[PDB]
Amino acid sequence: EALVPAWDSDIIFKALCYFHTLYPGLIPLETFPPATIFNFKQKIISILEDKKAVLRGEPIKGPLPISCSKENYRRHLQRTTLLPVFMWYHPTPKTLSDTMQTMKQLAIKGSVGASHWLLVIVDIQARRLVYFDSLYNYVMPPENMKKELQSFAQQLDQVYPAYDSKKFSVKIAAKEVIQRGSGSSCGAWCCQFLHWYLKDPLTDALNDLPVDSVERHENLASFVQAAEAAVQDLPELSWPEA
Amino acid sequence: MQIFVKTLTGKTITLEVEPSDTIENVKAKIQDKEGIPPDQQRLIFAGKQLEDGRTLSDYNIQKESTLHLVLRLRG
Ligand SMILES: [Cl-]
């Protein structure tokens, strides 16, 4: 029974909560709503500004999560070393506001359609931005996304300076298509890649996958079965303690 | 009394409710405005999920309080 169903915002959130218990530097950012390709940079800048405020002992400007107490959120901003920025994408809408309307319409229908889950990891400790597209070039060619992210890295060096002067670097994770053998396995792939990264931030696991699509998909099914078992009894709509 | 319900787009819905209203009755009032079936809705106030079988007053919700509506988003 090797099924990989299309993972929704709720199971992705529960996996994040679980991954925080294992790696406390990960902050389980909410996915209701997740970021988009049109506001992920703004969302990350807002989070980093709040972390700077908590380190100075000042008030936060928000926005606050809805399933976390304000004081627990302040404790997670003090702790965190890694931002797991899930992004929901659809090829039809071309602005932020049009993408939010498309997201509501598909949420209410219960349809996957042409929608896709992407991941940007902000590694604060390594100063690394990592972009993972299981479909390789679903949004745009990778050399175009690297250029956009290189300009954003320069902005982050001003927003969130280190003690020393180290500049943010950019990694495009997928060197060719990852997700073969299914149209609906993107959210599962994102969580599997994030777990490999947490185990090893230099991971080369994407370059060591089975060649035939039916075996590669079976292995991801095993991960999905283990993750669903691990989160099943963890608290619904409730952040863990920092 | 009036209360507000925030959705994923950031748009706010206004409802007319009494404190003795059940959470299932609130979810029906949201269906009347937005066309979302109650079984697809979860509601949050003060960091906690509001449970079917309880009332608004069981959570000390007051005039002009804001609730959050959560949906499941596939991809
Ligand atoms: Cl954290």
UniProtKB/Swiss-Prot annotation, chain A:
Main location: secreted
EC numbers for this chain: 3.4.22.-
Its membrane topology: Single-pass membrane protein
GO CC annotations, alphabetized: extracellular region; host cell; membrane
Subcellular location: Secreted; Host cell; Membrane
This protein's UniProt keywords: Hydrolase, Membrane, Protease, Secreted, Thiol protease, Transmembrane, Transmembrane helix, Ubl conjugation pathway, Virulence
Active-site residues (renumbered): 116, 133, 186
Enzyme's top EC category: hydrolase
One Gene Ontology molecular-function label: deNEDDylase activity
Gene Ontology biological process: protein deneddylation; protein deubiquitination; proteolysis
Statement: the UniProt record of this protein carries the keyword Signal: no
Induction of synthesis: Expressed late in the infectious cycle.
Family stated for the protein in its record: Belongs to the peptidase C48 family.
Assembly notes: Binds to host NFKBIA.
Main function: Effector proteins function to alter host cell physiology and promote bacterial survival in host tissues. This protease possesses deubiquitinating and deneddylating activities. Impairs ubiquitination and degradation of NF-kappa-B inhibitor alpha (NFKBIA), thereby preventing NF-kappa-B activation.
Protein name, entry field: Deubiquitinase and deneddylase Dub1
Gene: cdu1
From Swiss-Prot, chain B:
Annotated site location: Essential for function: 68
Record organism: Homo sapiens (Human)
This protein's name: Ubiquitin
Domain Ubiquitin-like: start-end pairs: 1-75
Whole sequence portion shown: 1 to 75 of 229
Outcome after substituting residue 72 to G: No effect on ADP-ribosylation
Membrane topology: Peripheral membrane protein
Subcellular location(s) of the protein: Cytoplasm; Nucleus; Mitochondrion outer membrane
Post-translational modification: Phosphorylated at Ser-65 by PINK1 during mitophagy. Phosphorylated ubiquitin specifically binds and activates parkin (PRKN), triggering mitophagy. Phosphorylation does not affect E1-mediated E2 charging of ubiquitin but affects discharging of E2 enzymes to form polyubiquitin chains. It also affects deubiquitination by deubiquitinase enzymes such as USP30.
Annotated site residues (Interacts with activating enzyme) in this chain: 54, 72
Phosphoserine PTM positions: 65
